[PDB]
Amino acid sequence: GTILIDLSPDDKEFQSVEEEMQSTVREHRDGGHAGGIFNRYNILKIQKVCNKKLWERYTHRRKEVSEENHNHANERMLFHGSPFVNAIIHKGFDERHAYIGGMFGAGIYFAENSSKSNQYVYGIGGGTGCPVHKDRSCYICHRQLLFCRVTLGKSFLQFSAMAHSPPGHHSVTGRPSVNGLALAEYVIYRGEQAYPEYLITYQIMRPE
Ligand SMILES: Cc1ccc(-c2nc3ccccc3c(=O)[nH]2)cc1
């Protein structure tokens, strides 16, 4: 039931998504090992992901959360990188898409920094890099990320350097406590709490 609609680069919606992508790049403590070395991207395409059943699944859960949290879904737009991007856009997020070994337990992880999600496009730790060249810092091969609508509800705050949500909470927030430039990361434990709104196709760019 999924169709993908291309956005024009002249469309204000394309432009605002590209700006969130570019402006949330940061340097990583691995020196580029997992995601590659880059300061910016070449955006090749942005598509809207349209699936009525998957949208209604999201809004149903969003209302449940809202009603448990004084009419506040605490909805964010966050990045997700995964080897399962093609399954997610067709079938929706579920337990198969969780990071079993994540530091906040087995759940589905999202980032404010697009470059954090870029570290997972080719698997945990960048896996073995692109399929064609086996290069985690490949500047040629086309990558994909999702920019997702995510319901956090009442979020458990962890101050740091599928399972269940902590009792009385709908998500976990990983607050950075050492790297002053890192943005927050988030975990949900129910696939119904995220919708893959935009599929972004891009390359990382070699710094000059
Ligand atoms: C199988 C698998 C594992 C981890 C990710 C993943 N982990 C993250 C951890 C922190 C912040 C963002 C992400 C992310 O986008 N994907 C996706 C799929």
Ligand SMILES: [Zn+2]
């Ligand atoms: Zn490659």
